[PDB]
C-alpha cells in the first residue's frame, strides 16, 4: 500500500548521506526523493512510516532494527504511531 | 525555533487546497513549500509539528483547534508525539 512512498530509495539516500557524516540528512534526502519521484512521496502515510522509522533511530536503537521493525509492522495508518 | 519550517505558509497552502476540495493536500503543500524554500522545511522537527497537527485533524478534531493547539504546545521535539 506504500509503493508510492519510495521508502527504500529514501533509506538508501539516508544511509549514504549519514555515511558521509552530512548535516540534516532526513531533510536533504526528503528533498531529493521529492525531486526525483514527485509529490506522492510526501503523503501523510509516507510521513507516518518515516516518522516511526526515524524516531526509533533517533531514540538510540539501530538503523537496521528500526527499518525492519517499521517495515514489518507499519502500514502508514495514523494509529500506527502508538506502537511503532 | 521552528521558523525554518515555514509553517504559516504551509497552512496557507493547505487551507486553500482544502477550500478547492483537492486530493492529497498534505502531499501537495509539502511539495510546494520545499520547492519554494528548500530542504530546511523537511527537517524532522518540522515533521514532528506537522504530524501532531494533521493527526489531530485526521482523527476528527476541527482543523483550526488542531493548528492552534499544536502551535502553542509543540516545539518539534521527538517526545512531543507522546501528548500532542
Author numbering:
A (entry chain B), B (entry chain A): 6 to 89
Quote the study's own text:
The venoms of marine cone snails constitute a particularly rich source of peptide toxins, known as conotoxins. Here, we identify the sequence of an unusually large conotoxin, Mu8.1, which defines a new class of conotoxins evolutionarily related to the well-known con-ikot-ikots and 2 additional conotoxin classes not previously described. Functional studies demonstrate that Mu8.1 curtails calcium influx in defined classes of murine somatosensory dorsal root ganglion (DRG) neurons. When tested on a variety of recombinantly expressed voltage-gated ion channels, Mu8.1 displayed the highest potency against the R-type (Cav2.3) calcium channel.
To elucidate key structural features of the SLC superfamily, we determined crystal structures of Mu8.1 from 2 different crystal conditions referred to as Mu8.1_38 and 59 at resolutions of 2.33 Å and 2.1 Å, respectively. Each protomer of the Mu8.1 structure comprises 2 regions. The dimer interface is characterized by both hydrophobicity as well as the presence of a water-filled cavity surrounded by the polar residues Thr36, Asn47, Thr52, and Thr56. The residues forming the largely dry (water-excluded) hydrophobic interface include Tyr31, Ala32, Phe49, Ile53, Tyr59, and Val83. Based on evidence from the analytic gel filtration and SAXS measurements, we concluded that Mu8.1 exists primarily as a dimer in solution.
